[PDB]
Design a protein around this nucleic acid. Structure first.
Lengths: 46, 271, 94
RNA sequence: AGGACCGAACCGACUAAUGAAAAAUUAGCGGAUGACUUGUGGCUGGGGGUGAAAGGCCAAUCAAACCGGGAGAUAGCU
RNA sequence: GCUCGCCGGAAGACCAAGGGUUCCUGUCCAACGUUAAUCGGGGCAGGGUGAGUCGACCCCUAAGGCGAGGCCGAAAGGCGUAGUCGAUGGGAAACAGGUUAAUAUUCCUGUACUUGGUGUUACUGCGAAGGGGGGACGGAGAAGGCUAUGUUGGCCGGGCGACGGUUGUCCCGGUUUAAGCGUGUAGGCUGGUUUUCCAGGCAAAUCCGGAAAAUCAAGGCUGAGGCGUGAUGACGAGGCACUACGGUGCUGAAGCAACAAAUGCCCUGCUUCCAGGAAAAGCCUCUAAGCAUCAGGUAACAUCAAAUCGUACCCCAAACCGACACGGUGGUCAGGUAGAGAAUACCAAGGCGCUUGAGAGAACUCGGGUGAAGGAACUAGGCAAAAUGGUGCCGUAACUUCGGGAGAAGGCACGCUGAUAUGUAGGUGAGGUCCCUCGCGGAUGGAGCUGAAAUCAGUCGAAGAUACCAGCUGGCUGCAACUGUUUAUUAAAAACACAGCACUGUGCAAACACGAAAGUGGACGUAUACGGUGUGACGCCUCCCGGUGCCGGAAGGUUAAUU
């Protein structure tokens, strides 16, 4: 059965990657939030 | 000519083809071509703005000349061509100076016919001259509404317009709709009717044919649930309401012209 | 033209392994560890100057670092650049 | 020629019996040059989308997704 | 190690995606592995991924994204021009053999190619953000020419049979060879060459386009395959020396022909249809500003250059998505016998026996086999089973929209051997002989090879479409015309859609829709069009305006802000 997650690196990066997050305001805020929390992996970026 | 196809299969039974042998069997004039990608009836927001559009065959865009400005040069018709972009047929013409253009093929036009634009041009089919030069009572097509803009009225397969009157700076046209309309007398127009008049006699004959023409199927509002359409819901088949659009506006009669800027040019509305 | 200092900083070490020994003995090819940033021409220049020996050609590759586990803690070894440097016929290297 | 026929791949899912499986199995079943199917990428965002329309689908979640917040909502009830 | 068994259009081989060391070697067996474990995709250590020509990067663009200015917007921001990104598409170049425990079109051996510089001598119009050409394109169908590949014969090597026979019309194996360079064929497309002029190609153009005129019928482009060379080479069945029993080193015959033949190539071709079928660069070409005897261009020759990143391994799976060593997953390769076949059966190459076993041979459950007599009496219901099942030929009703119905129904033949005919009809096609504008040519010729289908005669069986495979059929009737779609995971239908019909709106800055707007779709469309609603092939058809809607009217009544 085709399960929901069907990985694709490029698609992952474009969707969720660092630059994408940077591009828009809301993404930047998300980034800031994650930094505040102390996340080790700020983004999906490997 | 129209051709009723033999019923060797359902979906072929009711088919009627409109076959013109005189069209060009060959690849169109490539210089005048250009790309034309499909919308899916969706705008820049990405939302569907006009339902029932989608798919269909890849099509190129022939660059038709509706402005028709090569004044004084006589042109000769090379061939008639299938345009997927319109109900009419187009004609590839060759001006004496070596330029080629696509034009709406009028009714009587065929290969070898000579045509001409200009004030001086002769009043014969396919020739194009300002409507102050065109005699009253003539049939014309590809009519400009604004001078210099390009023909906008009467471009569809078997349309034409009647010049009923010329009163000073304006002439009054009888549009195919039956609407009588004033138009500036200096606007341009092409003599005769537009060509492919038996276009209406074709019948698709199956669902797939409609799809080929980029038309997605149509769901009736009454078949929906109320949350979707004003007509939705009802146990079994119920329709206890006045007909309306998906957006609640009355459909069977309610007029919707709101343009107060051009009211003056409409002599008489259609009926 | 490569600067001497850069040349000196290129070459990290000789690589000892069975495959390396075989390459040395048969094909007259030395296997070096080099700076990850070091390009082929650079490596060649450095070979020529610092080992005083003619080079035919350099093949390079990047070795990825192994993931290991010290006790409970996971940790990755460094990636590093390997270079097969083929030396001109009759070139004997100390 | 064909939204033509029989029929593998491929797409589906009418009957049947039966956790390896949060929808499968085997035996049969429908379509199989088209309104077909499929890979890669793209676009449409929540009272919004999309919908050959079933209130279907929108990350195992849908008569209004998920995450966080108002928030210790309110609970004549247990 | 020897037997047995399974897959073999896969359960084999190679990739993409995704994973990220799982690869190889040594070592260990606590935990992990549904048991044991000396084994492992487990632990620990070490090793392993070599590129000018493969891919990325790079040049070019699609859908789309971002977007200087700009337009719009309380703010945030939205749209969008110039631009710039964006493959899943276009754009230069490599093949064969050998080698590692583990990489290889990457190492080695041989033989190649590419496109840049730089320098040269030789020549002499070069030059773009611009013009033109090209790239550049659909579906289906039909062949013909080919090859991949396979079969047989020939040849070469080996063999003479654990049991009757087996020196022959016997048995086993092998019989392979690239890119490149030369040739330019089967075939496809097109008339060429020169001269003159011209409101066209945003300017110019010697280019393209268009007009004339002259002259010759061959000119050019394209093109699989074959042939030659590449190759006195490599590889080569197996023989022979050493042996850490893993292998290493030497050596090495023949290496031809015919037939058959793709879904691959010629073919981005041809024929045809309507639903009318990317873009841009690379590439060719034309000039402009320019420069002017310099640069630049093309000409060969020399030299330098090709960086960087990926390259292990799995990849229909125990390594990816599924919590698991548990169904899903795109591409490429496609042997033999039978067969229409990529179905099916048995096999090859190759890969496996699915990580608990041993007994026993109760009930009951599951999955199968057979069954006297009856044959739907079962049951809500013939559910399920059973049955039918192929090719050829004969034959086939109502009704029909004249196409259908129809594989209607129902029947007959079917194996093997011999003869017709020491293998026919056909297909292919060598020598020889003749012609020739000479070649991959044309005629004639028929050797050899291959080879159905039929008829007649015989013959065995209970049975000859013998296994696997492979329609059940007919009669009346509701619904829906039909092919389609649908509740992912209890509903596939009479529901939706449909072609068709009707009403209605909409004159283009269209109606309408998404958008505080700008704008966008509608549509680069224009009433033979587009939108909305209902109905729903085809045939015969299809009173009431009082109510509520809509349309038109505006005499009077009433009536806002305002005053």
């Amino acid at each position: 059965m085709k399960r929901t997650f069907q990985p694709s690196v490029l698609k992952r990066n474009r969707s969720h990657g660092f630059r994408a997050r940077m591009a828009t305001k809301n993404g930047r805020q998300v980034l800031a939030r994650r930094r505040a929390k102390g996340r080790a992996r700020l983004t999906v970026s490997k | 000519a129209v051709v009723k196809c033999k019923p060797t299969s359902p979906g072929r039974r009711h088919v009627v083809k409109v076959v013109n042998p005189e069209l060009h069997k060959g690849k169109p004039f490539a210089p005048l071509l250009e790309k034309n990608s499909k919308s899916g009836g969706r705008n820049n927001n990405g939302r569907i703005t006009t339902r029932h559009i989608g798919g269909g065959h890849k099509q190129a865009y022939r660059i038709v000349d509706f402005k028709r400005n090569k004044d004084g040069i006589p042109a000769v018709v090379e061939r008639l061509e299938y345009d997927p972009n319109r109900s009419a047929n187009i004609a590839l013409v060759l001006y004496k100076d070596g330029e080629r253009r696509y034009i709406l093929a009028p009714k009587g036009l065929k290969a070898g016919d000579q045509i001409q634009s200009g004030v001086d041009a002769a009043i014969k089919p396919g020739n194009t001259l300002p409507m102050r030069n065109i005699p009253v009572g003539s049939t014309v097509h590809n009519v400009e509404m604004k001078p210099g803009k390009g023909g906008q009225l009467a471009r569809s397969a078997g349309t034409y317009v009647q010049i009923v009157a010329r009163d000073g700076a304006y002439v009054t046209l009888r549009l195919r709709s039956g609407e009588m309309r004033k138009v500036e007398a200096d606007c341009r127009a092409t003599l005769g009717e537009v060509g492919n008049a038996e276009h209406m006699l074709r019948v698709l004959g199956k669902a797939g044919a409609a799809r080929w023409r980029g038309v997605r199927p149509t769901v009736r509002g009454t078949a929906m649930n109320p949350v979707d359409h004003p007509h939705g819901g009802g146990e079994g088949r119920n329709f206890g309401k006045h007909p309306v659009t998906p957006w609640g506006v009355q459909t069977k009669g309610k007029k919707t012209r709101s343009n107060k800027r051009t009211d003056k040019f409409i002599v008489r509305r259609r009926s | 033209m490569i600067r001497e200092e850069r040349l000196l900083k290129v070459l990290r070490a000789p690589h000892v392994s069975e495959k390396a020994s075989t390459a040395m003995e048969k094909s007259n090819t030395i296997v070096l560890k080099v700076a990850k940033d070091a390009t082929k021409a650079e490596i060649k220049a450095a070979v020529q100057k610092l080992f005083e020996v003619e080079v035919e050609v350099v093949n390079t590759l990047v070795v990825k670092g192994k993931v290991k586990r010290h006790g409970q803690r996971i940790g990755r070894r460094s990636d590093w650049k390997k270079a097969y440097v083929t030396l001109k016929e009759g070139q004997n290297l100390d």
